[PDB]
Enzyme design. Structure first.
Site, mmCIF file in Angstrom:
data_model
loop_
_atom_site.group_PDB
_atom_site.id
_atom_site.type_symbol
_atom_site.label_atom_id
_atom_site.label_comp_id
_atom_site.label_asym_id
_atom_site.label_seq_id
_atom_site.Cartn_x
_atom_site.Cartn_y
_atom_site.Cartn_z
ATOM 1 N N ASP A 37 13.224 -12.232 -2.504
ATOM 2 C CA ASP A 37 11.785 -11.937 -2.740
ATOM 3 C C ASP A 37 11.476 -12.125 -4.228
ATOM 4 O O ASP A 37 10.557 -12.825 -4.619
ATOM 5 C CB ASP A 37 11.526 -10.472 -2.350
ATOM 6 C CG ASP A 37 12.390 -9.543 -3.220
ATOM 7 O OD1 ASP A 37 13.587 -9.798 -3.326
ATOM 8 O OD2 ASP A 37 11.842 -8.615 -3.799
ATOM 9 N N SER A 78 8.525 7.278 5.638
ATOM 10 C CA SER A 78 9.336 6.133 6.143
ATOM 11 C C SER A 78 10.796 6.553 6.315
ATOM 12 O O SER A 78 11.177 7.686 6.059
ATOM 13 C CB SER A 78 9.248 4.965 5.151
ATOM 14 O OG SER A 78 9.987 5.271 3.970
ATOM 15 N N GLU A 134 25.833 4.326 -0.800
ATOM 16 C CA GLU A 134 24.607 4.332 0.055
ATOM 17 C C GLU A 134 24.950 4.836 1.467
ATOM 18 O O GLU A 134 24.416 5.831 1.924
ATOM 19 C CB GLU A 134 24.015 2.915 0.128
ATOM 20 C CG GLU A 134 23.412 2.525 -1.242
ATOM 21 C CD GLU A 134 21.918 2.879 -1.310
ATOM 22 O OE1 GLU A 134 21.269 2.848 -0.278
ATOM 23 O OE2 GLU A 134 21.449 3.174 -2.403
ATOM 24 N N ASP A 172 7.457 9.558 1.473
ATOM 25 C CA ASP A 172 6.213 8.748 1.680
ATOM 26 C C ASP A 172 5.849 8.681 3.171
ATOM 27 O O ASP A 172 4.691 8.592 3.530
ATOM 28 C CB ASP A 172 6.432 7.331 1.132
ATOM 29 C CG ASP A 172 7.727 6.750 1.694
ATOM 30 O OD1 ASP A 172 7.730 6.364 2.853
ATOM 31 O OD2 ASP A 172 8.688 6.684 0.957
ATOM 32 N N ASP A 184 15.103 4.856 6.343
ATOM 33 C CA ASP A 184 15.948 3.656 6.108
ATOM 34 C C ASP A 184 17.093 3.605 7.115
ATOM 35 O O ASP A 184 17.800 4.577 7.336
ATOM 36 C CB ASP A 184 16.536 3.688 4.695
ATOM 37 C CG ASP A 184 15.676 4.557 3.788
ATOM 38 O OD1 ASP A 184 14.675 4.061 3.304
ATOM 39 O OD2 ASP A 184 16.037 5.703 3.587
ATOM 40 N N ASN A 198 12.656 9.037 3.773
ATOM 41 C CA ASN A 198 11.784 8.971 2.565
ATOM 42 C C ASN A 198 10.558 9.859 2.790
ATOM 43 O O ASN A 198 10.021 9.942 3.888
ATOM 44 C CB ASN A 198 11.334 7.529 2.315
ATOM 45 C CG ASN A 198 12.406 6.559 2.795
ATOM 46 O OD1 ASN A 198 12.515 6.288 3.971
ATOM 47 N ND2 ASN A 198 13.203 6.004 1.931
ATOM 48 N N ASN A 232 14.677 0.479 4.004
ATOM 49 C CA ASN A 232 13.464 1.295 4.329
ATOM 50 C C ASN A 232 12.613 0.607 5.406
ATOM 51 O O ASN A 232 12.426 -0.601 5.400
ATOM 52 C CB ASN A 232 12.639 1.497 3.056
ATOM 53 C CG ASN A 232 11.493 2.469 3.340
ATOM 54 O OD1 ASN A 232 10.359 2.063 3.475
ATOM 55 N ND2 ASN A 232 11.743 3.742 3.452
#
Length: 129
Positions: free
Chosen positions: A101, A50, A35, A48, A52, A46, A59
């Site tokens: 989560d 966004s 990563e 969309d 990170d 990203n 993100n």
């Protein structure tokens, strides 16, 4: 800042990340390796709308926020830039919160297949601590 295998292993231990909820350092290092390669500066983008930030890549639309992401929710309630501190403590703190989560790490593209189904020793072998 950059984090070596044993430096990261020691830091991950001081943070209580080794085997955290079962996530052994092998999962953390494998994920962080491809990563950001254990780096508190490697940022990603990203489509969309966004971005990170953070050694483990977080993100700014679903995990954190930077104040520039064109519409972001933020589920970690933490500033993305802070994930680039000289200490993994920033990201580990948000990670230790995000990994609670329900999806956990079943999202990061690297861990998803390069680790969640490969090996968890090649990322710790040596730092026997």
């Amino acid at each position: 800042k950059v984090f070596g295998r044993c430096e990261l292993a020691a830091a991950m231990k001081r943070h209580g990340l080794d085997n955290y909820r079962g996530y052994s350092l092998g999962n953390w290092v494998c994920a962080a390796k491809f990563e950001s390669n254990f780096n508190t500066q490697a940022t990603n983008r990203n489509t969309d709308g966004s971005t990170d930030y953070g050694i483990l890549q977080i993100n700014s639309r679903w995990w954190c926020n930077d104040g520039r992401t064109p519409g972001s929710r933020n589920l970690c309630n933490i500033p993305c830039s802070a994930l680039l501190s000289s200490d993994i403590t920033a990201s580990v703190n948000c990670a230790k919160k995000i990994v609670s989560d329900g999806n956990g790490m079943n999202a990061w593209v690297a861990w998803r297949n390069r680790c969640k189904g490969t090996d968890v020793q090649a990322w710790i072998r040596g730092c026997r601590l």
